[PDB]
Amino acid sequence: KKSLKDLIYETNKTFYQVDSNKVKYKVGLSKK
Amino acid sequence: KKSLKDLIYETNKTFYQVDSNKVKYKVGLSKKQ
Amino acid sequence: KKSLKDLIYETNKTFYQVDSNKVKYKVGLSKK
Amino acid sequence: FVPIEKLQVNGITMADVKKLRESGLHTAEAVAYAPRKDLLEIKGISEAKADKLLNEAARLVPMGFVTAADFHMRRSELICLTTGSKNLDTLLGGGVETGSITELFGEFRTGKSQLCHTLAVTCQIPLDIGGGEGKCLYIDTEGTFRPVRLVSIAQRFGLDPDDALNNVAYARAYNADHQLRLLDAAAQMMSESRFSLIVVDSVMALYRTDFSGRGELSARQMHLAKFMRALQRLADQFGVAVVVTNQVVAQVDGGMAFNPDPKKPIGGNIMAHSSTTRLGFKKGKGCQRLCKVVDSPCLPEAECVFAIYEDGVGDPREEDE
Amino acid sequence: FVPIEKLQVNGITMADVKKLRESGLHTAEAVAYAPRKDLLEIKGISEAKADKLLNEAARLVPMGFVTAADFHMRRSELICLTTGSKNLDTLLGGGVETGSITELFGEFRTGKSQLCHTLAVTCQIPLDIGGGEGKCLYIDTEGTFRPVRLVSIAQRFGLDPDDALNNVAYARAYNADHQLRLLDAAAQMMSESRFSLIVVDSVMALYRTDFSGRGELSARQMHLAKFMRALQRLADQFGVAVVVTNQVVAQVDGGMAFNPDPKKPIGGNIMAHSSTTRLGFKKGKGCQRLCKVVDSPCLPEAECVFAIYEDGVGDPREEDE
Amino acid sequence: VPIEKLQVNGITMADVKKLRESGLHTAEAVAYAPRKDLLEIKGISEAKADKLLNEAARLVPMGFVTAADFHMRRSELICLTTGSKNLDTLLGGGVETGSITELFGEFRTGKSQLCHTLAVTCQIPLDIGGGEGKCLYIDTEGTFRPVRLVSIAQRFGLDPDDALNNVAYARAYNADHQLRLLDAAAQMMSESRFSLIVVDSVMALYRTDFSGRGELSARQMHLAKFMRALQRLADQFGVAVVVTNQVVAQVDGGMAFNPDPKKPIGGNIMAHSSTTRLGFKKGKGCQRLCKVVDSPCLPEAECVFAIYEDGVGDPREEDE
DNA sequence: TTTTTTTTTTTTTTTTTT
Ligand SMILES: Nc1ncnc2c1ncn2[C@@H]1O[C@H](COP(=O)(O)OP(=O)(O)OP(=O)(O)O)[C@@H](O)[C@H]1O
Ligand SMILES: Nc1ncnc2c1ncn2[C@@H]1O[C@H](COP(=O)(O)OP(=O)(O)OP(=O)(O)O)[C@@H](O)[C@H]1O
Ligand SMILES: Nc1ncnc2c1ncn2[C@@H]1O[C@H](COP(=O)(O)OP(=O)(O)OP(=O)(O)O)[C@@H](O)[C@H]1O
Ligand SMILES: [Mg+2]
Ligand SMILES: [Mg+2]
Ligand SMILES: [Mg+2]
């Protein structure tokens, strides 16, 4: 039942050598 | 007389060494799956 | 004077040993 | 499908299979459909090894003939995903058809992306109500993907909003090369989990600007042909429905006045020939929209009326009538 | 035709015929037409044996001359497949000719696939109503074959839908190499049962993407020529009618403007010279289409109008007029 | 000059029969045969070969001749009528017998229609540009339609029954079969009077039979033998030879002077073998354009001709 | 010393009258 989140995590490092947990996705300026 | 289906069986058998009773075309996602 | 049909018949006989009266051209699925 | 690991017969080892996967081949059908030239381009693959792979794949996937009677029965069991509108489904004869490419084109605000958002949820509901029971993959080349629409739509169909959002994969393409390269990663996720829909929105958004002038027209169309060919292969291997959107431009020349529509889709002849079913979109009165079947191998040319609401695409209501 | 088993004379053993069958030769015509060089690559075929094969085959298959009167008599007995449209039947002088390659090209939704579907049914109806009393073989490269259409058309001509769908062999091609390989399988089928039509739809779809760039143009054209030559040999061997559809491209170089049509078909000079008859299809008004003979050795350059209906291709009706 | 006239000075019928089986059917063929080929066939020794060449030279001219006499002989050449006055004036009378004429161009430009027209006009009397001889048609594409002949034959007054009975048709399935058919053609032309040879087309089979760059040397060498055989047919019998050819697009854009991006197939072997070459282009409707690309004596020019139901003819005012 | 081949491919609106 590999969750999609973990499956996407495996695919990103397989293809891009990117730590997804550290390099997230930004839509713009955020209040954080 | 030999039907066309039967004629398909041997030709697939001869060229691809495959049993057409085991492998069949699948054209997408079937309701039976 | 020899007709063309007989002249052709002998030429086929001497070049292929083919009975031109029995082995004939066919062009497609015939109606007979 | 058939896993590529089943080719581990008669001298095929992990190294041979692993080399194939890194080149973009993830299923047995991928090996069989691949031409001999492409396999020879992979390093570490010899002519003797390449020919062995084709023979083994052919014995596993159907590469021969079949009677049209059997093919008729196979196509009668095909899954069609509902579009949320009875009028749209009736015109399409069941809904969007899996295993084929469906193209939607029209002006802005006509409802191309709204339909795609509806399809991203109807692909998860059970088959008894016209669903697909599989995940969706959404590729956006404009930044217009809005998960808020999915939440409202999922509530209409009774799905859990958290589960609905967790079964959709979203990726954004920034250039033509990046858009094509995303398909290779998409193929890998296909081989490891059950998906049921591919959405590209839109296709020609980045090809329009990345290639400039008539000098790059030949290169632009050749690259587009490769992209659409790869999309076709995904439908062949896994059976996922392919839905793509497109934009339109005005016809400056008035010679083609016999066509009441003064706008034509962007993509040229490659885009027109590649799609299996083409649908045109126009804006109606209020929230209502018009859909027209332009080209289809088995659907007569006809039109229907649908509407856009908060909970996705649905049939027009008498209040709007 | 002449069965290959008739060559088992004068030292020709069982293995000699079996080797020939494995090499793609299934009729005494096929070996007679095969060049002497081609017969030399078969293992177990010697210098003397190849000459003996050619001489014996030539004894059963005519290679000499014939008077134009006799050939004219034979051509008057040719079976022409009806297209289902009186206007189109008159344009082609009886219908689709057997023993030759007919090419249909045009834009999309122009009825090329609809015409092929109708011919797949009309090749089984009796001779007196324009049929051929045979089976159809439908090779498809785009995935747009629908047995649903055959059910509707077969009802129009008085055929049983189950029997109509049981006499049409179907096979899909996935690359250029597979497309050419399917012809050898067809020849074996055709030597054991009566076929009257073979359809490839379409030809250049796979060649467009398998060969990329100007550097592979020479390789692409020569591979295509091999495929077309193989198709012609099937017509000579069995007499069946070959129908191949083609796509179209919009010419951009506006150096010439004499031709009002800004669209030309894919294939180059290899496709132009190979096809015996070429027909151009255009869209008219509504469900009407325009057909025009482009190249034919014995037909004047005319134009006719035909319409597509749910029961097949037919003459335009007064409702549309 | 019949080959049977060599039955003198010790040459018997056995030697002549061997010559006939080797492809030599006329005294000219023996005379033009190089000494190597005569020794290749069995049954003939060096003394016999020398005797044959000496005897053949006695009946066939081999010495010198003044240009005045040669001009006088060529003024009596028979030019087959093409059916169109525009082409007849362009070529100085039409297709000349005894020499190779080549036609090339894009499809539906009327190359095969002209060959069908010539196949009928070679049987009408000499007073109207005919040849009063039969025709031989070798087709390598399977596009020979006798229905065209009947329509054309009615225009020229010929009986359709006799027109179809004076035309011999053969189909070539491979390059080897195409070359061997000329050997059979020689025997037929040695028994009855022929006036036209048509090959349609030449490079159709050579393009596919020899595949790849490694076989280009073999492909061009086989083609040279076919043209040498064709020239020998014109020398022995005087029959006109009309051959058609396809065209190929020159992808290399290095040169741009020529408005035509298409060139004939065959290479320099084809270009140097053909005495006369004509280029065909499409005009308005039934009209076409013919341009004399190469000719030893005709100037480079152009004309317009039209394809009609009764054959090839001059364009009418309706097309104008 | 010898001896050429072979086509691709669409873009994209403007602007009141009294
Ligand atoms: N939450 C909503 N409730 C109701 N209608 C909405 C809502 N969101 C969008 N719409 C309607 O949908 C329209 C947008 O349509 P859509 O985004 O599908 O267009 P599109 O054809 O994909 O256009 P584009 O070329 O901009 O990508 C809006 O103009 C509006 O009429
Ligand atoms: N059942 C039907 N009843 C009536 N008309 C139909 C039916 N099915 C299809 N059509 C018509 O035929 C058209 C499809 O044409 P078709 O698929 O034969 O064209 P094509 O030239 O082969 O296309 P492509 O380039 O996509 O392969 C539809 O757009 C519609 O007008
Ligand atoms: N009976 C006829 N009446 C009028 N025009 C005709 C007739 N038959 C053929 N044509 C014309 O001749 C054309 C065919 O030309 P032709 O057969 O000479 O071709 P070609 O130049 O040899 O080309 P290819 O062999 O490459 O196809 C047709 O397209 C048509 O325009
Ligand atoms: Mg959108
Ligand atoms: Mg089609
Ligand atoms: Mg021709």
Residue numbers in the entry:
A (entry chain J), C (entry chain H): 121 to 152
B (entry chain I): 121 to 153
D (entry chain D), E (entry chain C): 80 to 400
F (entry chain B): 81 to 400
Article, verbatim:
Rad51 is an ATP-dependent DNA-binding protein that forms extended right-handed helical filaments on the 3′ single-stranded DNA (ssDNA) overhangs that are formed following end processing of DSBs.
We obtained a 2.8 Å resolution CryoEM structure of the 39 amino acid residue Hed1 peptide (residues P118 to P156) bound to the Rad51-ssDNA filament and 33 of these residues were visible within the structure (residues K121 to L153). Similar to Rad54, the Rad51 binding motif from Hed1 bridges two adjacent Rad51 monomers within the Rad51 filament corresponding to a buried surface area of 1,494.4 Å2. The N-terminal most portion of the Hed1 peptide is composed of a short loop made up of residues P118 to S123, followed by a three-turn alpha helix made up of residues L124 to F135, and it ends with a short loop region composed of residues Y136 to P156. Hydrophobic contacts include Hed1 residues V138, V143, Y145, and L149, which interact with a hydrophobic pocket present on the surface of Rad51 composed of residues A137, V140, P141, M142, G143, F144, G318, V319, and A320. Three additional Hed1 residues within this region contact the second Rad51 protomer: K125 makes contacts with Rad51 residue D149; residue I128 is involved in hydrophobic interactions with Rad51 residues F144 and V145; and residue N132 which makes hydrogen bond contacts with the backbone amino and carboxyl atoms of Rad51 residue F144. The Hed1 and Rad54 binding sites overlap with one another, such that the binding of Hed1 and Rad54 would be mutually exclusive, providing a clear structural explanation for prior single molecule studies showing that Hed1 acts as a competitive inhibitor of Rad54 binding.
